[PDB]
Amino acid sequence: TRLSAPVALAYREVSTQPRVSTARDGITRSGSELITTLKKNTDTEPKYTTAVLNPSEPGTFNQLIKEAAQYEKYRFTSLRFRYSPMSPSTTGGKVALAFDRDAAKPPPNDLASLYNIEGCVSSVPWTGFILTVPTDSTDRFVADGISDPKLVDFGKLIMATYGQGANDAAQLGEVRVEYTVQLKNRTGSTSDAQIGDFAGVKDGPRLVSWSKTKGTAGWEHDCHFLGTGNFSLTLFYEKAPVSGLENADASDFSVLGEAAAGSVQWAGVKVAERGQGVKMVTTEEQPKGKWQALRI
Amino acid sequence: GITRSGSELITTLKKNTDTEPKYTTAVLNPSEPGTFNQLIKEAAQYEKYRFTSLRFRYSPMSPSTTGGKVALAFDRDAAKPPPNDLASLYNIEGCVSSVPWTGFILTVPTDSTDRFVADGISDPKLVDFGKLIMATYGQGANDAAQLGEVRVEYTVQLKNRTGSTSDAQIGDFAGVKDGPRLVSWSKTKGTAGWEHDCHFLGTGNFSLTLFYEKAPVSGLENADASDFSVLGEAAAGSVQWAGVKVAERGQGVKMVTTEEQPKGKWQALRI
Amino acid sequence: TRLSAPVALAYREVSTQPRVSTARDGITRSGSELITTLKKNTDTEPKYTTAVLNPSEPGTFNQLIKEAAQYEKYRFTSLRFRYSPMSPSTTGGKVALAFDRDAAKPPPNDLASLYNIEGCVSSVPWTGFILTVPTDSTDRFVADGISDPKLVDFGKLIMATYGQGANDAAQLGEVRVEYTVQLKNRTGSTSDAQIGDFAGVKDGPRLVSWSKTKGTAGWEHDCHFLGTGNFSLTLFYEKAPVSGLENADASDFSVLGEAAAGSVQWAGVKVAERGQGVKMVTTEEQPKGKWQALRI
Amino acid sequence: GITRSGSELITTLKKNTDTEPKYTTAVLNPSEPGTFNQLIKEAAQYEKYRFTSLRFRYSPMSPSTTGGKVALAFDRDAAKPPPNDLASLYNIEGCVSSVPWTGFILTVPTDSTDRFVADGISDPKLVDFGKLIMATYGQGANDAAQLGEVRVEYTVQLKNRTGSTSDAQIGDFAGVKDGPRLVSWSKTKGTAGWEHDCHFLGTGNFSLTLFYEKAPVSGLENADASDFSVLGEAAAGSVQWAGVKVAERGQGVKMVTTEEQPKGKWQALRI
């Protein structure tokens, strides 16, 4: 029979209270976080935005990272993502949420493959839906350095948007996690400041992801920030580089320092959307030095 | 024997701004590239099937202010051509229609008979389980470009087993063709000469390689494909390697030789 | 009190199963059919579209025609028309359904007269309504040739649209019959292919309706098709005409034949909307020949 | 979820006159072209597996007058090099051997742990179930050229469906590879220039297409493949399209050039 269509739907969101408790082996923390807000995509093919599901991941969790710094292993006993619409009912396209159990595989390339992923749900941008992912009973190590994501990460969420019109809402919605993790073991509190050289060494929370790319001037190392917020980045060059730190696509980038042998720079980068970063240029592939990312 | 449930995207319906309804069909056979993109790989290794459970879903994609309608019906005779008037379509058993901005479902009762996986030359009444008819009509000029997506949620029982069928459809200009029915060529004489053009029955990224024994009038050229990029060199005794992106069925590329049934070889793949 | 207005209303339509049964005198068939889809009318005065209510009428019934070819008389024990909206709630104008018990009277000429018809219902294009027509207990002959519609036809439905804006939905809705006919008597199965000459003879289902019109070149006979679908039309000219068969306002017209004395043509006309047809020109009023309409 | 059973053909063993074993391993992962020729296509659609059952049958093919021995062993570590002496080979759990003209079967007890489908980059200890080792030795100087064959009868549970991986391998001479690991490239500075060798890790009919930005010194040449038919001409901006039939793993085709990293792209295919 008849089924009406509203002009818009309003969801009231209130920050709940995390439920912490103590068990025999560790603690059991429940809560909810905000990952990101989906943006309009005026193209038929999807545009993806990923978020690795693992405590101590600044991009995904904001408060569970601190509570997971005191523990060594985890087990997501129950997690579930929710979508809150903030666009009228006259917006086209679609929104798709899928959970890839492999955290290294890149997101698919065509819409047909996106729908083959198990559990992939989707709906119109102006209505809310929930994707609940079955969990398992395997303990994994909280991220601590450069390790295979198959061995530490539980999975990776994939958010896609497509099919929206030209004159549509700028932002369609926002995803929200609802987890219940089982932190186990215990250890001396670990610092939260990724530190590593340019030879592929990393030690700490995954705040940064460097990527070389050969160019006419030299090898360009791009410091992509996985989270969204205020960061600081100290660099130490052993050999004089072609150029210091430059704003690639981030917002409000400032650097106090100089580029030269033995010199140290100090950049207070600011990120408005996950993936933005800075860049530097050198003539030596795999240069010698250090860097330190921090959430300041 | 193997049971493989799943869900796949057949196509995405598009606006019908003209007056006559537009009908798009998709034969329900596990080896059909038009309707299946993942079960085809599994069915290539089997020579019998039975659809334990079949059902189709329509997922809206258009604004709430979209006119017209969309219909979904299942015809058990895969040979019959698509209907000619709307009343006959609505007279098919279990035909479900609704406005573009809302989704619905169409459950297809299934029998307990086995059929040979399609090879492309057998009677459709003997191999195919049926076909699906998707109708779109009554849309104005102010409506969205895309209405929705049709998907098939199935549960097949592939039986027996055999040598895997070739993943690439090799063939020969105006001659024999082997492998999955990915493309189909056609010829029409013209001013420059005989024009050979191919049509891609599937949708996705393809890879067409060609070999000319004699210098053609012209090399590969986009006809109506979404994207196109040739990387070869048209000439006598040469090969042209091209990549074609197809958004809707029937899109393809073309060539000119001026000699009917030119001697050569072509290969098609769904990269 | 308050009464909300949706952006649009969605009606789910599923093809039901006809209910056939056997009685003492014949059979009693129940079912539902689709007549047509109403189109926008950006004019104050109405625009009409008629459908004669009689089994063996290709324009109205599509499946009951076959079941009524084996019977001689009928009685609509219960019929009722329904309107399904497929336009947003921002469309103006109105839609009117009326049942004229005289199947020959032309539709009215002004909106005032349309509302004097008994039982005439109407509503906004974006909402559904039902017009149920009282029936009687009189048996009538199933249409078989050229006969007075007062004697064979039960009635005639009239559908009108008007008042829509310029930027409104192209099509407003679609009507749908819901009948319960009582077929009686019985006879050898009759063919479905109207056949007749140009002297006013017709024998078979009412698929075509010729109409003369004097012109400068000659008398033009227009072959209006009452239904909508694929048709074929074979013509036989005894005297050479001015011109053969030409596409008047139909779609996808093709003819295999020649125009000359004794020659025969064969036109596979195709109709997208009821009323479209082809035409031919002759210098002789009431020419000698034959024609045969068929649903191929 | 899905469960499949099959019986593939790994390889055919060859005579070894030397009394010391000559090993040929075969990593056991569903997405391994060297081992599985049909399971790879359905494993590309899933990202986890669990071998419920597993056996390796050696089917003799040599006459009754051939000496020596043939041994099949299963090493649960897929990175350990094959042993260096007979005693170490026979210390492996479950190792079974016999004279070439007598058949035997090796049953490998399984476990209840799910492993990620191999990507070729991850640790073999973390994604590979094991590694089969086949050895031969002691044959006389006038025995049959090729001994029996080896087949794998399995029952694998694939889980966690996902987007299908490309069925054709597309790569670049700069070290880029994205596909089902069907080919490997190497460099060896000869006398005419940097020579690129293309060793096929599978066994069967193939199809290699290359695009040259600059004219190479020479086109594809049959290094040790059973068959090789090249189509097209080698030159600047040209494309070649060869069909190679491979009977033993490692057989490849050479192409010499004056540049260590020639600009272009290739495409391997198991036609």
Could you write out the three-class secondary structure of chain B? CEEEEEEEEEEEEECCCCCCCEEEEEECCCCCCCCCCCHHHHHCCCCCECEEEEEEEEEECCCCCCCCEEEEEEECCCCCCCCCCHHHHHCCCCCEEECCCCCEEEEECCCCCCECCCCCCCCHHHHCCCEEEEEEECCCCCCCCEEEEEEEEEEEEECCCCCCCCCCEEECCCCCECCCCCEEEEEEECCCCEEEEEEECCCEECEEEEEECCCCCEEEEECCCCEEEECCCCCCCEEEEEEEEECCCCCCEEEECCCCCCCEEEEEECC
Q: Collapse the DSSP code of C92 into the 3-class scheme (helix H, G, I; strand E, B; otherwise coil) and give the result.
A: coil
Q: Which of B164, B209, B233 sits opposite D38 (nearest CB)?
A: B164
Contact predicate B148/B5, CB 8 Å: no
Q: From residue C123, give the alpha-carbon distance in Å to each of C40, C95, C96, C190, D222.
A: 14, 6, 7, 41, 80
Task: For chain D, state the CA radius of gyration.
Answer: 20
Q: Which of B8, B101, B102 sits opposite A115 (nearest CB)?
A: B8
Which residue carries 């009326």 as its tokens? C98
Two structure tokens written together for D2 = 């899905």
- Cα(B244)–Cα(D218) distance, integer angstroms: 29
Contacts of D271 in chain B (CB under 8 A): 166-168, 170, 267
Bridge partner list, D155: D5, D53
Bridge partner list, C161: C47, C95
Q: Which of B2, B44, B270 sits opposite D2 (nearest CB)?
A: B2
Q: Collapse the DSSP code of D266 into the 3-class scheme (helix H, G, I; strand E, B; otherwise coil) and give the result.
A: strand
What φ, ψ does residue C67 adopt, rounded to 5°? -70, -20
Contacts of A89 in chain C (CB under 8 A): 7
Q: Strands of D239-245's sheet, edge to edge?
A: D176-178, D169-172, D264-268, D208-212, D239-245, D227-231
Q: D75: which residues sit within 8 A by CB, 6+ positions away? A: D82, D92, D130, D131, D132, D133
Q: Between chain B and chain A, are at least 3 CB pairs below 8 A?
A: yes
DSSP class of residue D35 equals T
> B164 to chain D, minimum CA–CA distance in Å?
7
Contact predicate A272/A247, CB 8 Å: no
Which residue carries 């390790």 as its tokens? A147
Count of alpha carbons within 13 angstroms of residue C194, beta-carbon side:
27
> Maximum distance among all alpha carbons in chain C?
76
Give the angle A74-A75-A76 at the CA atoms, nearest 5°: 125
Residue C170 contacts B where some CB pair is shorter than 8 Å: yes
Contact predicate C174/C34, CB 8 Å: yes
Q: From residue C136, give the alpha-carbon distance in Å to each of B263, C140, C154, D221, D242.
A: 75, 11, 9, 91, 82
Q: C45: which residues sit within 8 A by CB, 6+ positions away? A: C110, C111, C162
Q: Strands of D252-257's sheet, edge to edge?
A: D183-189, D194-200, D252-257, D221-222
Q: B248: which residues sit within 8 A by CB, 6+ positions away? A: B11, B14, B203
Contact predicate B35/B97, CB 8 Å: no
Residue A93 contacts D where some CB pair is shorter than 8 Å: no
- Cα(B151)–Cα(B137) distance, integer angstroms: 19
Contacts of A115 in chain B (CB under 8 A): 7-9, 151
CB B9 to CB A111 under 8 A?
A: yes
- Cα(B112)–Cα(C229) distance, integer angstroms: 36
Q: From residue A170, give the alpha-carbon distance in Å to each of A39, A95, C120.
A: 6, 14, 48
Q: From residue C197, give the alpha-carbon distance in Å to each of A163, B94, C291.
A: 57, 42, 6
Q: From residue A42, give the alpha-carbon distance in Å to each of A122, B59, C56.
A: 17, 18, 51
- Cα(B256)–Cα(C215) distance, integer angstroms: 50
Contact predicate C222/C210, CB 8 Å: yes
Which residue carries 């040599």 as its tokens? D62
Q: Collapse the DSSP code of D88 into the 3-class scheme (helix H, G, I; strand E, B; otherwise coil) and give the result.
A: helix
CB B239 to CB D240 under 8 A?
A: yes
Experimental method: cryo-EM
What φ, ψ does residue D58 adopt, rounded to 5°? -95, 120
Amino acid at residue number A46: P
Q: B64: which residues sit within 8 A by CB, 6+ positions away? A: A5, A89, A90, A126, B101, C7, C8, C88
Count of alpha carbons within 13 angstroms of residue D23, beta-carbon side:
19
- Cα(A266)–Cα(B142) distance, integer angstroms: 54
Contacts of D2 in chain B (CB under 8 A): 2-4
Bridge partner list, D170: D178, D267
CB B67 to CB C86 under 8 A?
A: yes
CB A112 to CB B205 under 8 A?
A: no
Question: Dihedral (C-alpha) A276, A282, A288, A289: value to the nearest 10 degrees?
Answer: -50
- Residue whose C-alpha is closest to residue C128's, from B143, B101, A3: A3
Q: From residue D49, give the alpha-carbon distance in Å to each of A250, C291, D97, D111.
A: 41, 71, 29, 12
Q: Collapse the DSSP code of D196 into the 3-class scheme (helix H, G, I; strand E, B; otherwise coil) and give the result.
A: strand
Question: Which among D2, D31, D47 is the top mutation candidate for probing chain A, defined by the most A β-carbons within 10 Å of its own β-carbon?
Answer: D47
- Residue whose C-alpha is closest to residue D29's, from D201, D235, D251, D256: D201
Q: Which of B65, B67, B88 sits opposite C171 (nearest CB)?
A: B67
Q: A54: which residues sit within 8 A by CB, 6+ positions away? A: A60, A74, A103, A140, A142, A143, A152, A153, A154
- Cα(D67)–Cα(D102) distance, integer angstroms: 11
Contact predicate B197/B257, CB 8 Å: no
Q: How far, in whole angstroms, is CA A276 from its chain's centroid?
A: 11
CB B91 to CB C17 under 8 A?
A: no
Two structure tokens written together for C95 = 């839609």
Contacts of D116 in chain A (CB under 8 A): 102, 150
DSSP class of residue C66 equals H
Contact predicate D220/D242, CB 8 Å: yes
- Residue whose C-alpha is closest to residue A143's, from A56, A223, A78: A56
CB A150 to CB D48 under 8 A?
A: no
Q: C263: which residues sit within 8 A by CB, 6+ positions away? A: C236, C237, C257
- Cα(A152)–Cα(A139) distance, integer angstroms: 9
Residue D123 contacts A where some CB pair is shorter than 8 Å: yes
Bridge partner list, C100: C156
CB C229 to CB B84 under 8 A?
A: yes
> B201 to chain A, minimum CA–CA distance in Å?
15
Contact predicate A162/A47, CB 8 Å: yes
Contacts of B38 in chain A (CB under 8 A): 116
Q: Are strands C155-162 and C13-14 parallel, antiparallel or unpaired?
A: unpaired
Contact predicate D162/D44, CB 8 Å: no
Contact predicate C61/C154, CB 8 Å: no
Q: Are strands C155-162 and A232-237 parallel, antiparallel or unpaired?
A: unpaired
Strands (E), chain C: 9-10, 13-14, 26-39, 47-53, 73-74, 76-85, 94-100, 121-123, 130-133, 140-141, 155-162, 171-184, 195-196, 208-211, 219-225, 232-237, 243-247, 264-267, 277-282, 289-294
Q: Where does chain C have alpha helices with state H?
A: 64-68, 111-114, 149-152
Q: How far, in whole angstroms, is CA A24 from its chain's centroid?
A: 32
Q: From residue B74, give the alpha-carbon distance in Å to each of B28, B31, B57, B96, C11.
A: 10, 18, 12, 10, 20
- Cα(C179)–Cα(C82) distance, integer angstroms: 11
Q: Is C56 left (phi over 0), alpha (psi -120 to 50) or beta?
A: left
Q: Are strands C289-294 and C73-74 parallel, antiparallel or unpaired?
A: unpaired
- Cα(B96)–Cα(B104) distance, integer angstroms: 8
Question: Dihedral (C-alpha) A16, A22, A28, A34: value to the nearest 10 degrees?
Answer: 30
Q: Are strands C232-237 and C289-294 parallel, antiparallel or unpaired?
A: antiparallel
Q: B219: which residues sit within 8 A by CB, 6+ positions away? A: B230, B232, B233, B234, B240, B255
Q: Which of B42, B211, B269 sits opposite D168 (nearest CB)?
A: B269
Bridge partner list, B197: B186, B254
Q: A67: which residues sit within 8 A by CB, 6+ positions away? A: A20, A27, A29, A55, A183
CB A94 to CB B62 under 8 A?
A: no
Amino acid at residue number B225: A
Two structure tokens written together for C129 = 């309504």
Q: Between chain B and chain D, are at least 3 CB pairs below 8 A?
A: yes
Window 1-60 of D, Cβ < 8 Å to B = 2-4, 6, 37-38, 41-42, 44-45
- Cα(A207)–Cα(A204) distance, integer angstroms: 8
Two structure tokens written together for D183 = 């080919």
Bridge partner list, A161: A47, A95
